[PDB]
Write a protein that binds this DNA or RNA. Structure first.
Ligand SMILES: Nc1ccn([C@H]2CC[C@@H](COP(=O)(O)OP(=O)(O)OP(=O)(O)O)O2)c(=O)n1
Ligand SMILES: [Mn+2]
Ligand SMILES: [Mn+2]
Ligand code: NA
Ligand code: NA
Length: 327
DNA sequence: CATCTG
DNA sequence: CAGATG
């Protein structure tokens, strides 16, 4: 956790680059198990050979660990930090819409910067365009005090459209968090479930409402159940308009709201121990359901949940206020 | 995983 | 349809 921090980190840079610049997934994958093992490892790796000793740790990695331990640095790491090509790919990639794949193409065409991007707005698609338009705003975190106004909004219009809607703002917002990065809304309706055959309108009508009153400004992606957009809190009395914010909205069968709802609330960490404990308590849990684990090895059967309450209970746990879901 | 591009 | 993105 700090004993092998450097090593784990360099390995991480190294891993990252494989995947992003080069396309060495295998190699890339290599750095990752390595870092994961050297991460859990209890002592102070004093050398390469010491590390080699681990699974995941081969000769190459070992070599690296050595040079790194030997001197506060790594050549290859040094060479990568310079190389403008590598840097460019790391940067283009910040644009929502551009991944490595694409980060690669554009570079090979000469688009390496933001400007390049603007000039070549033609080669970009819709999402990327948006991303480009809001690069800045995209990176600003969401101050909790804003979230409240936002939540305040979605929740009223959702209501107006249908009294039966049930929206929940999950995420870190939901977890206490002073600021968050995106707004995720969970959505269900009594009239939408496991079996029931669809009702896309369910998701569409709200989306519309939101843009009706101008809270949603753009559409990144709109499906029958998942919507990815951009939104903004109405600028008050002209002087300080708000940044454009990322927002996702998801339709869920009413029969698996809470699992989902619970689940998005995270944190990853809160998740697992819950999952793990659930496993003890004789269960199973995922994004949509909880299930009584048979003994034959495994087994299913969607336990019936009417709250986050019904869940914990299952696993015979203490109901965790959202804040306390930290880990 | 669900959505988009091409 | 494979392949990309979040
Ligand atoms: N690959 C992933 C990503 C997320 N999650 C969970 C973690 C919380 C939830 C949605 O949260 P995000 O917006 O991804 O993150 P957050 O925890 O809300 O953090 P923030 O919004 O501050 O970035 O999904 C998961 O199980 N697996
Ligand atoms: Mn989030
Ligand atoms: Mn999200
Ligand atoms: Na990106
Ligand atoms: Na293939």
């Amino acid at each position: 956790e700090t004993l092998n921090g450097g090593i784990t980190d360099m390995l991480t840079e190294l891993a990252n680059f494989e995947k992003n610049v080069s396309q060495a997934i295998h190699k890339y994958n290599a750095y990752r198990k390595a870092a994961s093992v050297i991460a859990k490892y209890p002592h102070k790796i004093k050398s390469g050979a010491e590390a080699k000793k681990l699974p995941g740790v081969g000769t190459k990695i070992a070599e690296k660990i050595d040079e790194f331990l030997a001197t506060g640095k790594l050549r290859k790491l040094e060479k990568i930090r310079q190389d403008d090509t590598s840097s460019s790919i790391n940067f283009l990639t910040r644009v929502s819409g551009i991944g490595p794949s694409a980060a690669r193409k554009f570079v090979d065409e000469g688009i390496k910067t933001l400007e390049d991007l603007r000039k070549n707005e033609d080669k970009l698609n819709h999402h990327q365009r948006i991303g480009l338009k809001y690069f800045g705003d995209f990176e600003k975190r969401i101050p909790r005090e804003e979230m409240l106004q936002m939540q305040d909004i979605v929740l009223n219009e959702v209501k107006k459209v249908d009294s039966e809607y049930i929206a929940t703002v999950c995420g870190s917002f939901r977890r206490g968090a002073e600021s968050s990065g995106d707004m995720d809304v969970l959505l269900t309706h009594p009239s939408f479930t496991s079996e029931s055959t669809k009702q896309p309108k369910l998701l569409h009508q709200v989306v519309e409402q939101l843009q009706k009153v101008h809270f949603i400004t753009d559409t990144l992606s709109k499906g029958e159940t998942k919507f990815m957009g951009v939104c903004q809190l109405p600028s008050k009395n002209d002087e300080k308009e708000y940044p454009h914010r990322r927002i996702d909205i998801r339709l869920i069968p009413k029969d698996q709201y809470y699992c989902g709802v619970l689940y998005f609330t995270g944190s990853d960490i809160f998740n697992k121990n819950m999952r793990a404990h659930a496993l003890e308590k004789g269960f199973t849990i995922n994004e949509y359901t909880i299930r009584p684990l048979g003994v034959t090895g495994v087994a299913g059967e969607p336990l019936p949940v009417d709250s986050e309450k019904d869940i914990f209970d299952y696993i015979q746990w203490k109901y965790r206020e959202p804040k306390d879901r930290s880990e």
